[PDB]
Amino acid sequence: TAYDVILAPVLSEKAYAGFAEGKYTFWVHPKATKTEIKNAVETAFKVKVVKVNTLHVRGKKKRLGRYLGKRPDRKKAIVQVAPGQKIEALEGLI
Amino acid sequence: MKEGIHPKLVPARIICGCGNVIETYSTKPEIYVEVCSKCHPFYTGQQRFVDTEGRVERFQRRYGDSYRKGR
Amino acid sequence: MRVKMHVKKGDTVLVASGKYKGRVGKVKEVLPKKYAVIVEGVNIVKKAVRVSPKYPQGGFIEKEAPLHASKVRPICPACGKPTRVRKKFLENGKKIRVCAKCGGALDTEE
Amino acid sequence: MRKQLEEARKLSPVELEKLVREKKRELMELRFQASIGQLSQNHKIRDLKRQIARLLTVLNEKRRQNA
RNA sequence: GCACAACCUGCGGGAACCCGUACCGCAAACCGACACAGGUGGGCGGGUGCAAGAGCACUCAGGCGCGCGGGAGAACCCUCG
């Protein structure tokens, strides 16, 4: 309770280009306030929170032998930089 | 509840009927009237000390009001 | 054959079997006594995968089932297992003692 | 790391505070890892979580003792 | 209270979160237990011609070709001359 962390980067393709020049996209604690995004963002990666937007998605179509389901809840949020800093290794990475 | 008495309980039941008589007169009982009903008292009031009421119910009333009249 | 057991890594005999030739009990569960005596398996003529040689057929088959194995063997083979008399300050020593004896002392061998 | 049980015993207010916080961050590191080293990681994840968990068990014990 | 730091008004600076879009959607995805010709709300409804016009006939864009095929084609119900 108060363990700041609240996310998992958007290893997502399309989301790549943004990482590429100025914005970055990730999966975030389905719940964090957008200002929550700004803070986790800022103190976490020592940056400059710019433009913080959000989207959400649940799962559809998972057949399980004799019964079925479709998954849980994956949350999406995108935040941009001010200069183009931080996330380096992550980005060079994927 | 919202209409029993105030000075005890007098709010309820009643099964009854009749038909007719003619017994130790000339015969048996013209027997029958499978009926059901209510059965109760009345309302009224006085004053604590400038500004009041009572509400209550009938008799129990009269004696009572007399009582707290004593105080 | 329950939440409780017989020998463990131990080293014991096969009565009603096909081998009897006792030896290293490579592993033994808690509930299904499921124990492998490394005494009779097969090949599972493997996947056809490169999992096993790209030209496969697994070798060491050894899941030991039946429980007629005569666990424990001191200078004596088929023997039940005793318990204790403690003898020393805080002494469980549920070692195995009957006729000959074996307790699997933490030394020279299991 | 019963030993860690010990360190635990050892620290207090702001201490345990930033300890569990930073450690937590560490596990974040893990979160990140969700697609890199991985293999020997496993444990950093499960255990690390158990660890920090303890961290909290303690804070509770101590400040609870308090108020 | 204000009135010396309340409101009206410029410039600078700084802020602004929660849930929402995909696509189907006069319809095989919405309602009739079916890829059921039934019903289901508002937006000009392109054009030519017709006195007028969302009716008429051919079309603009845009949309199809209904989803089981080929075959001779007599009875006879259907539809129509």
Next chain:
RNA sequence: CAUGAGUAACGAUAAAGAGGGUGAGAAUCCCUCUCGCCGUAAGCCCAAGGGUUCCUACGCAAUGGUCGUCAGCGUAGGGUUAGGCGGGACCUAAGGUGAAGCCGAAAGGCGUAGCCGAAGGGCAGCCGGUUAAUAUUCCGGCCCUUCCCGCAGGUGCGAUG
């Protein structure tokens, strides 16, 4: 599990014919070329309601009223983000609730006030460009919105009765 039955039936008399292609197999998939029927709809559009699916990639034994290398089918992965669009962060009627109050054998009946409660009120952006895929949400050009800190100028300012 049989039976009429391998006859009745394929969901609209808005017709289709070719060439080449891909395929284990293509009347029934793909391009392209002839051709008919819509067009005032078989248009697009917002909304409702559906809630997968949409896409991209593999696959078809089930499913389509046979096909079927096609799919809204199966398997996997990715896909919608908006101070200014919408709704709440505001308003309220019918209307529900309901502190009061009147009221029932009990459970309730009735109910001002305040509240909840609407494509009925009110409110600050538009257009051109970019994805397999979403847009006035993204990019860009252009036009603003209130609220906070300040400062600068200006005032009996200061309810929501």
Next chain:
RNA sequence: GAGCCGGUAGCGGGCGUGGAUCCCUGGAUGUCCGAAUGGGGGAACCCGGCCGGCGGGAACGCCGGUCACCGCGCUUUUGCGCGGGGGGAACCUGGGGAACUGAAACAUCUCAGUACCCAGAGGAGAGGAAAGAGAAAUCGACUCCCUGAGUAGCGGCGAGCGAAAGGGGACCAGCCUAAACCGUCCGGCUUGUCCGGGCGGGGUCGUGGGGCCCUCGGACACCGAAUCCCCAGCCUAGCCGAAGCUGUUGGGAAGCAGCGCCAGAGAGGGUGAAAGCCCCGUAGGCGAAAGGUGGGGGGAUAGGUGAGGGUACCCGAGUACCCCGUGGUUCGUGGAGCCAUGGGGGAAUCUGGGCGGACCACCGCCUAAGGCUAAGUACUCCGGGUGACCGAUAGCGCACCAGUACCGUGAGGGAAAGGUGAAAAGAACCCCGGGAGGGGAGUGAAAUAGAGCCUGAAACCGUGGGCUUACAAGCAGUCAC
């Protein structure tokens, strides 16, 4: 006691005899909904006001601690400090309370105070020390069982319905308060001498209590948890624990055979086909803990009980009682009693007053119009065990991803499917093929044991073989040949 990262075994990585898996008892956050209560709201999601915090400060926004309502008593000013509420298969008390069907119609009647709506206390409540019984100069709380008669009786005396004291049994504490009188006291009004409310002695058990006079009196009684300490019964973990091998037919043996074996423990299951001596911490007996629960046995804690006569009396209920209007009860209207209440009347302090006999004269009875609770019959969610109780269409419907699929708007209805084998060794590999699937090799004791795969029959369709059949009218057949 030495192995585990639940049902997944697989991948990819691990912790542990410096008690790791895990069995138990108490621990910590303990998301959002749900009584919800800070507010709203189509619950499980959106709002807000106070102190703390961090960040880009203010605005933003999260952790956080935060803030219904009720009635309840306390300092009228804490509105501080409590209570409840919300449940629950059946049992349970009271509240309100029905047609069928019977009476072969059916209106009294009947099912019945039964079904059901409700409110509510529990772990069990219910009732529970007599204005009782009953008539013997008798009993003695209440509750539940057997009996009491299905008589005594209730009634279109019809269908029907149907007691109670006693006796046998079981389980056996009894205890209390306003009850003006005492005095005390504070408030009173208004002052003297009334009421009001606190302490008491009185605080009626089968009848006194108080105040005056005298005999009085100087250690055994515990509660309904008064209360506390214990062997706390268990909770779930514990522990031991009886005796065979050789052979042998078998894929097997625990089986046929040989000899040797146990037994305060031949209950059963489990170990490749039927073991006392093989598996089982069982019957044998014993085991055990610092938590969560108490009856016992005993202690202490023991409120409070526990004397005698005398004397003008004042001291348990606001309605007893009587008229009609009604409930109970074996009572349905009746000669109809007692308790019980809706109307109007409308009082007695132990010469008191209801009760036995409608009522009157008797004797007798009990002591009413307040309070408390144990113990013996009920009930079944949940645990344990036993079954001339069931085998997968019976059993709970439900034997295991059945109260879910799926129909209905909601209310609501409400399936099916158990087994491959002994163990996975469950199918490398070669061959037709797009695939499935098909022939081989290996499996093996069998694979006509092959994955819906044990035993696997009837029905129906199929491949081959025998007899039979184109001038035939007949369920069928069937006797004959």
